[PDB]
Structure 1
């Protein structure tokens, strides 16, 4: 394979899958390498710990550990991962990286890669008043129940909700007014993170249940029809890059991530320390479900594929970062 896996040092659940997905976001990895962490503390700095993990994944021939990384942002118990969905963990990592990039050239790199623009609108019917609420988004949670595939999920995602009964819109001064509620996509990020809503509740037993309904996702995803304004020369055509899967329908289950890091159709399976070649069928079709199925998908805009997946070489790692990390080994290599 040529790629190195991550150690299983506890009940980190989806973390190892997320780290591999972000590590192969080459443009993000390069940005992480450029972070000025010379003065940061080794124990408390998430950006530094994140640099160490990416560095070891790129140079180490043995499984890479993540104890100091989890210890940096405080998720040191299985519970910590039970409290949050996968996207909320991705937010803690990206926000730690983005803050450290403030006051630099690479500032705003995370928003450029992951952030999208949408608007939540409420339009009155009898009277002329419209409330537009602009909101950035770094991920999209798709409803899969009764939905055949991503295409059908996006159609439902943009459905128009009606407010006309007792649930009339409180327009403040206008009081109660029949209105329509909806969401409109303004832009789609170069790297599209999609989460499938497979965790459900379930009031009778008062527990969260995973639904294993079949949900299909293509290798090529066209999303131009859902944008409010289309941009010629930059079509909203996306290419599948990673497939995060889970088995067991519980936090105590099995977590793995499938990736074609080069976006060339050559897929690999990342199962903790074991990285093995696999077919497109094992990575895609075998994860549609219908208890091992996909819960998160990563798509990359085709026009930005060369830039997002640009090759990262040793020259892209600052010497200061290398000297510090290698200095760290000498202390630990004292064994």
Structure 2
């Protein structure tokens, strides 16, 4: 290997799956916690947490491309088009719901929200009566609008812009009746690991079909977000570092999926294209994926908070894998090897 990292097999139209798996694998802090999960009493092809432990172990250890058949079987997306029916954030919620669920009542409880959960305030403010409604809202990922948007900064501007509730569409202000009002969101916190989907694939917009937008959309290596926070912290600015770029070539139907990562967070990028992993330029991982006027562009970005980068990407050793886990896998390997 000229990269030191191994790829994942092409085993069907799994689309964004391999890309997402590498992205999660190189979230070292997540990966260590996953190894710690008590799975001894689980059924191999019925347990998502165990299946993920298998894939991570193999990605950490194998010199050969890693298979995912037991993993897809474990969360039940086994059909020809089962991945074409969903999107990357849905797969992501399935995987890490299953994982956080399993982590409840164990020594690594709380790992997932610690890494991925942020807080927003959602507000509704009546224009002409003293009524306002403020809610805490948690999120684990952010879907950013890109149509008509030149870059990530304006997607965020659009995200937190005020929506007007009037005309036909007045707000039901309960005791106050129908009322004109303003509705919006403000960021309270941003998580150590920030998952941003770029809404290139969307909608049934006067077509009653799903399309892919291939227009140019720029994102930076370094992403400052303090501006969008309701309240700022001097000792922890919301500066974010680009970790992964999930890429699609093609359009609203077919197409090829790859991911660019700089696993150590040092600006040294690799391209993961299923079983082929290769070192690439920064330019190829970043600007080359702005798209525009190819059909080869980013639909998801992973950023890590700069203050948390060293810890999120803490080194993993083979010792971080408990022996009991090592034995169940090794024995599985042994059975399989009679084939």
Q: TM-score, normalised by structure 2?
A: 0.97
For the 8 Å contact 1:82–1:251, the answer to whether it is kept is no
Q: 3-state SS of the aligned residue for 1:324?
A: helix
How many angstroms does 1:9 deviate by?
Answer: 0.7
* 2:178 corresponds to which of 172, 176, 191: 176
Q: CA deviation at 1:131?
A: 1.1
- CA drift of 1:240 comes to 0.1
Give SS of 1:31's match.
Answer: helix
Q: Which runs of 5+ in 1 are unaligned?
A: none
* 2:36–2:321 contact (8 Å) kept in structure 1: yes
Distance 1:229 1:203 in 2: 37
Q: Secondary structure at the match of 2:52?
A: helix
SS of the residue 1:82 aligns to = coil
| CA shift digits 1:80-127 (9 cap, x unpaired) | 212222101000000111011111231111001011100211011211
The 1-side partners of 2:155 and 2:214 are apart by 16
Q: Distance in 2 between matches of 1:203 and 1:101?
A: 40
Is contact 1:5-1:273 (8 Å) kept? yes
8 A Cα contact 2:117 2:191, kept in partner: yes
Partners of 1:105 and 1:112 in 2: CA distance: 14
Aligned with 1:247 (options 246, 249, 253): 249
In structure 1, how many angstroms separate the alpha carbons of the residues matched to 2:203 and 2:29?
38
On the 8 A contact 1:21/1:242 being kept in 2, the answer is yes
The number of residue pairs the alignment matches comes to: 335
Mapped contact 1:123–1:179 kept (Cα < 8 A): yes
Alignment-derived partner of residue 327 in structure 2: 323
Question: Cα offset for 1:274?
Answer: 0.1
Judging changes above 3 Å, is the alpha-carbon distance between structure 1 residues 195 and 232 closer, same or farther for their aligned structure 2 residues?
A: same
User: How far off is 1:201 after superposition?
Assistant: 3.7
Q: CA deviation at 1:32?
A: 0.5
Is the Cα contact below 8 Å between 1:11 and 1:77 reproduced in 2? no
Q: How far has the Cα of 1:204 moved from its partner?
A: 4.5
Deviation at 1:165, TM superposition (A): 1.6
Contact 1:193 1:297 in 2 (8 A): yes
Residue by residue, what CA displacement relative to the aligned partner does 1:145-180 show, whole Å, maximum 9, x if unpaired? 121111111111110111232211111221111111
Shift of 1:334: 2.3
Could you say what secondary structure the match of 2:99 adopts?
helix
Alpha-carbon displacement from aligned partner over 1:240-292 (angstroms, at most 9, x marks no partner): 00000001113531000000000000000000000000000110011001110
Decide whether the 8 Å contact of 1:121 with 1:181 is kept in 2.
yes
Query: What is the deviation of 1:78?
Result: 3.7
- 8 Å contact 1:245–1:294 — kept in the other structure? yes
SS state at 2:243 partner: strand
Alpha-carbon contact 1:144-1:197 (below 8 Å) kept: yes
Partner of 2:188: 186
Secondary structure of 2:168's match?
coil
Quote the RMSD (CA, aligned, Å): 1.1
Contact 2:13–2:84 under 8 Å retained in 1:
no
Deviation at 1:202, TM superposition (A): 4.5
Task: Tell me by how many angstroms 1:199 deviates.
Answer: 1.4
Shift of 1:238: 0.3
CA shift for structure 1 position 218: 0.2
**Contact 2:38/2:106, CA 8 A, preserved across alignment:** no
Q: Distance in 1 between matches of 2:32 and 2:270?
A: 22
Question: The residue matched to 2:119 in structure 1 has which SS?
Answer: strand
Cα shift at 1:130: 0.8
Structure 1: distance between partners of 2:87 and 2:234: 35
Q: Distance in 1 between matches of 2:114 and 2:130?
A: 35
Structure 2 stretches lacking a partner, 5+ long: none
Greater displacement, 309-318 / 196-205 = 196-205
